Amino acid sequence: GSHMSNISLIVGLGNPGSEYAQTRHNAGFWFVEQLADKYGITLKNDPKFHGISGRGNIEGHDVRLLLPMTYMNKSGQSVVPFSKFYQIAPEAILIAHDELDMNPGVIRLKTGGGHGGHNGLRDIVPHIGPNFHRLRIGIGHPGSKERVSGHVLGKAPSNEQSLMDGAIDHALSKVKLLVQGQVPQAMNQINAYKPA
């Protein structure tokens, strides 16, 4: 199983299919796909856990990566059995996701707290509780609840995409701290990011 708050499971939330790959709601997939390429972790088909998953070394630590293939609002149907099967406590889990309540180019590491309306996190917290770590990747808000679907299932304009991509790249450089259990230092250094 997991050990203390050494992060050993990194989840990216999103929807499957080419038609969703470039949409804001897949920010978590963007982060975990780029992390897997950085460290040479193979993301392979994982039908048992309704996902794509990998395992590999990050900076001397054995780490698992997970992308649910459930559709966003059913993400817990992947994350919960996967984390339970590998005996990974929530304290050792990082979930990367899009954050409506932050600007594009803002990124924050949060421990605990609610789903803030996020329909993927809404499917996870009832089962494992809130005490996992989250990489909140700012995507901006479209300005009414009725518009949230169209915004998160939209492809951001190039300036916003550039801002998100820079924040994501910054966060990739801080994963070494997280897998080492240095959550306070990682939180300080991630949350300090500015695009310009």
The length of the chain is: 196
Q: Which helix (H) or strand (E) holds 67?
A: strand 61-68
Domain ranges across the chain: 1-196
**Which residues belong to the annotated binding site for tRNA?**
20, 71, 73, 119
**Which residues belong to the annotated binding site?**
20, 71, 73, 119
Round to whole Å and give the CA distance between 7 and 179. Answer: 5
For residue 106, report the phi and psi dihedrals to the nearest 5 degrees.
-100, 140
Round to whole Å and give the CA distance between 108 and 66. Answer: 20
* Displacement of CA 62 from its chain's centroid (Å): 18
Q: Return the structure tokens found at 13.
A: 């939330």
Q: What does the buried/exposed string (b/e) look like for 153-172 if buried means 16 or more CB atoms within 10 Å of the residue's CB?
A: ebebeeebeebbbbbbebbe
| Adjacent-strand bridge partners of 134 | 95, 110
Round to whole Å and give the CA distance between 52 and 15. Answer: 12
Round to whole Å and give the CA distance between 138 and 158. Answer: 15
Query: CATH for 1-196, among 3.20.20.70, 3.40.50.1470, 1.10.230.10, 3.60.10.10?
Result: 3.40.50.1470
Q: Return the structure tokens found at 145.
A: 């609840």
Report the largest interatomic distance among the alpha carbons of the chain, rounded to a whole angstrom. 46
Give the relative orientation of helices 158-172 and 27-39 as an angle to the nearest 10 degrees: 40
In angstroms, this model's resolution equals: 1.4
Round to whole Å and give the CA distance between 76 and 90. Answer: 13
Q: Do 40 and 28 form a contact (C-beta atoms < 8 A)? A: no
Which positions are catalytic? 25
The C-alpha R_g of the chain, in whole angstroms, comes to 15
Whose structure tokens read 């856990």? 49
Q: Return the structure tokens found at 76.
A: 């817990």
Sort strands 133-138 and 93-99 into parallel, antiparallel or unpaired: parallel
Q: Count the helix, strand and coil residues of the chain and give each as a percent rounded to the nearest 5.
A: 40, 20, 40
Give the HSE-up count for residue 160: Cα atoms under 13 Å, Cβ half-sphere.
Answer: 20
